[PDB]
Design an enzyme around this catalytic site. Sequence first.
Site, PDB file in Angstrom:
ATOM      1  N   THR A   1      -6.027  -0.175  10.461  1.00 48.77           N
ATOM      2  CA  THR A   1      -5.586   0.819  11.446  1.00 48.77           C
ATOM      3  C   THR A   1      -5.552   0.323  12.895  1.00 48.77           C
ATOM      4  O   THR A   1      -6.539  -0.190  13.412  1.00 48.77           O
ATOM      5  CB  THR A   1      -6.410   2.129  11.362  1.00 48.77           C
ATOM      6  OG1 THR A   1      -6.480   2.561  10.000  1.00 48.77           O
ATOM      7  CG2 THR A   1      -5.765   3.225  12.193  1.00 48.77           C
TER       8      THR A   1
ATOM      9  N   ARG B   1      -7.705  21.823   7.745  1.00 47.73           N
ATOM     10  CA  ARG B   1      -6.587  22.213   8.606  1.00 47.73           C
ATOM     11  C   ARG B   1      -6.895  23.540   9.287  1.00 47.73           C
ATOM     12  O   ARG B   1      -7.660  24.349   8.764  1.00 47.73           O
ATOM     13  CB  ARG B   1      -5.287  22.358   7.802  1.00 47.73           C
ATOM     14  CG  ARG B   1      -4.992  21.236   6.808  1.00 47.73           C
ATOM     15  CD  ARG B   1      -4.574  19.943   7.491  1.00 47.73           C
ATOM     16  NE  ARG B   1      -3.220  20.014   8.042  1.00 47.73           N
ATOM     17  CZ  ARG B   1      -2.093  19.954   7.328  1.00 47.73           C
ATOM     18  NH1 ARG B   1      -2.124  19.828   6.002  1.00 47.73           N
ATOM     19  NH2 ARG B   1      -0.918  20.028   7.947  1.00 47.73           N
TER      20      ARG B   1
ATOM     21  N   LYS C   1     -13.024   3.925   1.100  1.00 45.82           N
ATOM     22  CA  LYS C   1     -12.718   4.030   2.521  1.00 45.82           C
ATOM     23  C   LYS C   1     -13.856   4.740   3.242  1.00 45.82           C
ATOM     24  O   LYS C   1     -14.162   5.895   2.946  1.00 45.82           O
ATOM     25  CB  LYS C   1     -11.400   4.782   2.733  1.00 45.82           C
ATOM     26  CG  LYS C   1     -10.192   4.030   2.208  1.00 45.82           C
ATOM     27  CD  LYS C   1      -8.942   4.889   2.117  1.00 45.82           C
ATOM     28  CE  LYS C   1      -8.482   5.392   3.472  1.00 45.82           C
ATOM     29  NZ  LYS C   1      -7.100   5.949   3.399  1.00 45.82           N
TER      30      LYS C   1
ATOM     31  N   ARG D   1       0.821  -1.211   0.000  1.00 44.91           N
ATOM     32  CA  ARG D   1       0.000   0.000   0.000  1.00 44.91           C
ATOM     33  C   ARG D   1       0.859   1.266   0.000  1.00 44.91           C
ATOM     34  O   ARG D   1       1.642   1.491   0.916  1.00 44.91           O
ATOM     35  CB  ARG D   1      -0.936  -0.014   1.208  1.00 44.91           C
ATOM     36  CG  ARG D   1      -1.681   1.291   1.476  1.00 44.91           C
ATOM     37  CD  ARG D   1      -2.753   1.073   2.534  1.00 44.91           C
ATOM     38  NE  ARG D   1      -3.366   2.324   2.975  1.00 44.91           N
ATOM     39  CZ  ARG D   1      -2.943   3.076   3.991  1.00 44.91           C
ATOM     40  NH1 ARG D   1      -1.881   2.729   4.714  1.00 44.91           N
ATOM     41  NH2 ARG D   1      -3.591   4.195   4.290  1.00 44.91           N
TER      42      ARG D   1
END
Lengths: 490, 495, 490, 495
Positions: free
Chosen positions: D303, D91, D245, D49
């Site tokens: 994860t 952000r 995802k 990946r």
Amino acid sequence: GMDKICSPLADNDVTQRKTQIICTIGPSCNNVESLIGLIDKGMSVARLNFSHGDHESHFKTLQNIREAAKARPHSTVGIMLDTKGPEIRTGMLEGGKPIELKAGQKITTDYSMLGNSECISCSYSLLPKSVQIGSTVLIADGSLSTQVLEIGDDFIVCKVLNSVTIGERKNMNLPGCKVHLPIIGDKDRHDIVDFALKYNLDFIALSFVQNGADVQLCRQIISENTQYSNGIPSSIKIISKIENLEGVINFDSICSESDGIMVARGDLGMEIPPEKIFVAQKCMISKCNVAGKPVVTATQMLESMIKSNRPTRAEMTDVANAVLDGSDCVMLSGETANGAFPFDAVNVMSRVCAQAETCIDYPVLYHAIHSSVPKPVAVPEAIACSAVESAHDVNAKLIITITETGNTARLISKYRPSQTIIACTAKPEVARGLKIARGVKTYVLNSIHHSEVVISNALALAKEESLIESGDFAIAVHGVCNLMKIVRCP
Amino acid sequence: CLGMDKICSPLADNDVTQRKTQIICTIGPSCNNVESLIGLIDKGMSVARLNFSHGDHESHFKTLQNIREAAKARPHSTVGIMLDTKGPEIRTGMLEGGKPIELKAGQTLKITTDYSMLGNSECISCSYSLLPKSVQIGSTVLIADGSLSTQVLEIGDDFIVCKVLNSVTIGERKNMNLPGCKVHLPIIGDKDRHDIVDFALKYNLDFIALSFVQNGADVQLCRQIISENTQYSNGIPSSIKIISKIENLEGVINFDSICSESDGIMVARGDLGMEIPPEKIFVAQKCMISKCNVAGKPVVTATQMLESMIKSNRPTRAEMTDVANAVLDGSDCVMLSGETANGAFPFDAVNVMSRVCAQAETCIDYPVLYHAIHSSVPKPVAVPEAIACSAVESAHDVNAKLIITITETGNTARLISKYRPSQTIIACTAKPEVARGLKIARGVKTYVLNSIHHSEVVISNALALAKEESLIESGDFAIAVHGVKCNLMKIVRCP
Amino acid sequence: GMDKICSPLADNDVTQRKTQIICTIGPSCNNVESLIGLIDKGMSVARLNFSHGDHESHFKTLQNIREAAKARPHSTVGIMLDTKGPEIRTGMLEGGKPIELKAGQKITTDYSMLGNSECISCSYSLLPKSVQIGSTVLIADGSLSTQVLEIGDDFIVCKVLNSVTIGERKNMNLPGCKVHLPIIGDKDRHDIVDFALKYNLDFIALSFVQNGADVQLCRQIISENTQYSNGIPSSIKIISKIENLEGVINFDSICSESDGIMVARGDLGMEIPPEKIFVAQKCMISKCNVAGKPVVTATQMLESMIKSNRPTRAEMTDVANAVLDGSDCVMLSGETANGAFPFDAVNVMSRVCAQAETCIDYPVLYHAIHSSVPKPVAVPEAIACSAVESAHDVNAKLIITITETGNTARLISKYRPSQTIIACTAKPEVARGLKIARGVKTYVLNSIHHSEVVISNALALAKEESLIESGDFAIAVHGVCNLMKIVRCP
Amino acid sequence: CLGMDKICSPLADNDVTQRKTQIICTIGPSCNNVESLIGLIDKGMSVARLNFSHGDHESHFKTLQNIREAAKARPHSTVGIMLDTKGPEIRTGMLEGGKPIELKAGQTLKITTDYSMLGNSECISCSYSLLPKSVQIGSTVLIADGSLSTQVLEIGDDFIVCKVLNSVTIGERKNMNLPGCKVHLPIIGDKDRHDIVDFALKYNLDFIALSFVQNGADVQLCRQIISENTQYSNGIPSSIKIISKIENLEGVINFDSICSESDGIMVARGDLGMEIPPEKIFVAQKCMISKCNVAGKPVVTATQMLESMIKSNRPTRAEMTDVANAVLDGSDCVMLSGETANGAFPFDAVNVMSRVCAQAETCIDYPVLYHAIHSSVPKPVAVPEAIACSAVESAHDVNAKLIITITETGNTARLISKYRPSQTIIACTAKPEVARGLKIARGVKTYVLNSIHHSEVVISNALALAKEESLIESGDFAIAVHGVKCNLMKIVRCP
């Protein structure tokens, strides 16, 4: 099971038989000694067919039954009144000579006329309104077959499809058609009130029920006629007979209104085709199991035993399959009433039923019924379930229930326990009423007010009748019905 | 799958046409001629049964010619032919004058093995010389179709003393039953061997209904005869199926051995009903049928299925449920005896049986029935059986209308039949005798082709016929089962 | 369920959480105010690890816990004693300098010797008798790995398989080997008798149990030491810790002898490979569900919360899966004791457990356990079953049980009802003892002699605590335990 | 299938070799060189990946060359290559001096959309200009990996006022999450389009891990780009799989739409854990995996699976159960991120994950798992799917060792994988890119042949290889699945 064939049926199973046997009374078993023989062979309910006979003839039979009841005090015998109901018959002819029939050839509402080979009469006044063009009509229980061609105002033309011989004033069937005759006539009114309510019978077999309103009509007559019971309404049970297609169509409404159901295969066999009867039987029985109301399978169940000591192999399986289908009651008609072997007919039906009950997988049957009931349920039905499960989990021998109405006994019967359900009640009318409940044996007592006393007596009587021994468990159920308890036999 | 519409909505003609349960008809005076045999085929007869407990080779040969002539008049039908053996039996002897005797309850009757003595009220004779060694003290002995019930008091060297239970009147040479006892008589005597070899094998019948099978050894004796006699088949052993008749408790006790050895089973309820209590018949039927279903062997339910129809055009309610329940129990075949052989309404009897069977099949929950059988079969299985039940599951999963099997012997068709698919099984074969053999297989129809070497041609020919016979429509799915050169499963679309 | 993700966890579910939370006490939560915080976050049992500390240090912690108990009277807090148990440590060296290790290079029972890089000492005197040739040995919790080469009389040679750095007096593991040290030493004897029995604690977490005889040995010490309870034997619970393979091999015997089980994954992780831990956990939990004895899943369940406010995603599923496996209790070690976020550790474990419980299909779970029990069962267990089934069938909110021992409360907990099990008892020792029973809330009363009084109070207290409203059903179970009743809340 | 022997009897090497669950390894500094990539293959890596939220095309191209060079050194292995997009993100802005700011609990913080303003304790800036219209009153807003928890008080026109929940210290340009809110940013911006077209399609990768998929429309946007750009594949559209995802609640809400549109699903637990309560992760995982199993789409659990192994050679007990349970939940793939990319023990991490997966697979009750899936699939199904699950049932019923599928695309192999057979699935294909595509399919191994036109040759070649690879022995059964010229199922014996 394989050894279930080789190993004989034990006397314990046949004595503790759960399926109830309804014997029809007739010339072959009318006297007291014969009725005692039927009770010994295993009769649960005596059936009185008012299609024939008069009040004086049936009243003498009623006295014989009750005298047979006193001769066997340890057993309990129900008494059923089967009405004649609505009926369709042809008219007179010569009246002497019977008219010949041929294929390719009428019927009139004018009952007062001399019918010939070209035209005949009919007692049913609304014959043309019921039958449409194309619908078939069956004179003389299926021996003559015709089809409706024209529909006149006061008549209806039809074309035959067979070379019949009869006849004068023979019966009629309208397969797939509603019959608009009144469910209870003046003959039936007189039977229900001045015999069933008068002499205080336990069951009314209501003939030819076609909808829920027909049962309400009978239910209204019972409430209105409280003049043989000092104003107190009778607790007599209404057993609706599904004798045609219309009853099958409105079965759910009929089943809700009525106390029980009889699958009258005889008349159904004349109304629906032979392929449908097993489907009709199994489906109606199954719905009665879900509804928690007793069902009766009747007619031609062992008819060959009218002329012989042993039944045909098709009749052997028929009784067994009726019990395996979930039938609470099994009935004999001509086998007991008109047959030459009434004691054998009852004996064979008793033993086959008992064998069928030993081949039932009760654990699976319980959950089959348990899942069919929607949740949440009322408290008494929750207690009823737990009694059946608990009996299995501790291997109890009996399920004892204290009941004044008998309803709790029927709730436990609904969930089909392997144990005998011992119902404890104060009045004999409830005990006789529970002779159509599968696997129930009733103890009548002086009082049912103090639980501990009733439970001790029931256990003591069960021990005397060899239904339980010392140390064995028994499920007791009663009020604080909201309570379940597991007790040991002293 | 039982509900409201199943009663009110009438039985479709497509349901009766595509009936799975096979019907065996006993041939006799009421349907011995060509006209009648054609009638039985149109009403649904799958197999014609010749009962060799009566008649002679000449009379039966005429009946055979008539059956095969009826088959030529209905080429789109296939009719199997069954030989039913007389088998061993026990008869009473003769009587003084004869001139029947009157027996009474409580009487002590003697039964002697001396068959030459003239019998009377006190003493009668019996053809079965091992009677004393077969019976025990307390054993029941029935005479004359159960009319005379007697019970054994003392056992002698060449006699037996019984207590007469009921008052009856018995004549000469009446049959005898020994409930719970093994009968030590040859299952195949000289007459039986003559009927098997010089009729069944000679004229090339499809089934031998072997009467009074008490153990697996009996079936092997019949198996030995077929292999030893190839006179009429040019050396090659016959493929005649052996259907063993379970008629007494000994057969019931040794059933597993019998079922393994036999090609099929007949629950001969008539004689079982004499040899065993009436409470046990339904159990004996349901259990033997279940075991046959698990074994993949066709079972036949027989006798008194529509008995009242012998002298009436309508059946009893008990008979109406008897047929339906036999199908629901998992019976491959149902049988008629007196109903067709010597009754007044043979064509009605076959009709009623056909329509009741078809209706019973429409109430079956096939997915449940499939998994019930599949779980009862020990794993691992052989390749053909794995392919067979894959064909059934695949058929359900794509909603296919037909399952087509190319088969040289018919064994694959029988394996597919075992797992009870809702869709019709089409067996494709080269030999007419294989098609006749499958006439006791539930839900199998068979096309006889000139060759089955080319798989693609056989399936296309099968689909074309099936489409023409209204068994499938354009664009419908069919499962095809055969071998590469049986171990292959195709899913094909109808053109 | 999909909406179970979008729809938040209600406050009702977390308040009525069934899985019990065992918090280990340490410097991070030693004071009274912190212990009250843990109770508010949802502590069920306080664990005292006697691997470290002395009686004086733990006694002050005991006083803090009990002071926290009085501050929250409506809650109940159990107190557990976790023993040090048998232990294997290396010997001294210089003793100052730690010896360097290398791959390809001994161990002696002579503990009194200066160990070098070539040879070291071991406290376990029967080291050579346990380990055979080929078996591995793990010094300093898996940082050093060796294999047994030779087996001397007073020593055992071994070859290393890694370049280790440590060390002086580090621990040891013998994976796949029986350790013949005594289960309870003089240190442990002093802890069990002069602290657990002295100050009357509720649970003994018995470290490193290897067979049934080890539990009997502890069971014998309790009966022998009745000098802090005036001759009356303590009802203190024995929770066996399965910390190695030998415990796993003899699990059935250990489970029968002990009251509960802890799946000590920490030491198991050092003894068996990582692939086996989930199998060991699930299998042992499952057997404890069948046996009807409480099981505890412990160690590294939320260890990342020692350094952060939120756990890792692997720890999130671990707690949930432990509850779904059927774990009665979940434990925190360093998360509560040594962590910087003890309140969050307990809070997160409480909410995840509660969510996991809402994702359980109780109807199916009941029958999964019901079928696992052999029939016939004892009367109390039959009553226990029927209480759980009846609660579901009428949709009752609570299952009230009258119990003096607490055993009936554990029997009902065995069959995993969706309802909260309200246990009614006379002594607080039973209430604290039921803080390892899943889904049980205990009401302590002055007396439990008159049933009707106890049931009325329990219902009244439940109504005050908002666990039931007027009209709602509740299953009551008590003695005539042989009785079940369904009652309405006033 | 969990018991005593499953703990005491150690994990066999045949179980780890024949592992079904696929392992995805994120490549990075700790394993960027050829030596390490070969190491990851030997320890069990199925897919490499490449995370394009960091680095540039040049650095990733070097890593790609290294992956493919490692593949040449292990020709008997097949390694798929995955491109993971950066996707949209939010952000915080800059700070006065910067020079971090100190926020306190109870404080009222302002978040402005003016990204050019210097931020301070009272006010900071946000890159997401639709912040006010995405958030509602009471919505939670997380900043800097959840460090700063804030709650919305008032919504302005170009600003938002939040109540700081906890005392923290935030720096410049820290990430932002909006739990329960849809983010209205393009899923594929210009950088993402550059990475997809000029790297994934250009260098011919196998998977696109599409970050932050919130609805089926997002997947179609990526689908549109693949069809519109055929520059590097001579006109023919790429067969690159789109693995969506699920990272926030919006993706969870629109999951069914996403799953239908995508080729696979990744349960991105990391970002989900920020966007949704920690109590909901296990539910979200188990439910999404179940739906993927029913849909026949491969799912990836990702994860913090062995997070502690970043700085330790042994995993946590929670991590030891996390991996096992993901496999038992029905996950096709499991993933490593920091563990392999930038940890100290990458080879241990892949080893531990491999051995725990294999052990979990030995505890599966495959017959139960088969019927659970088969019952959840609506009937009727298409022909290939019916054949596929017949291959699984047949395999069990004859105790076959391998299921062999001849497949031009790999779709049949994925259909067989859906029904979770205990036996290994052998996919036989002509295209290496198909073999690479099946590296996210549970329990599939693939042989790449020069041609698959002749069925008999392909199966014999497959059996010979499989026998040589110890996947089958002489006389063992294998199920062969292909098309006549996919709709055919064979049962073949190994020579």
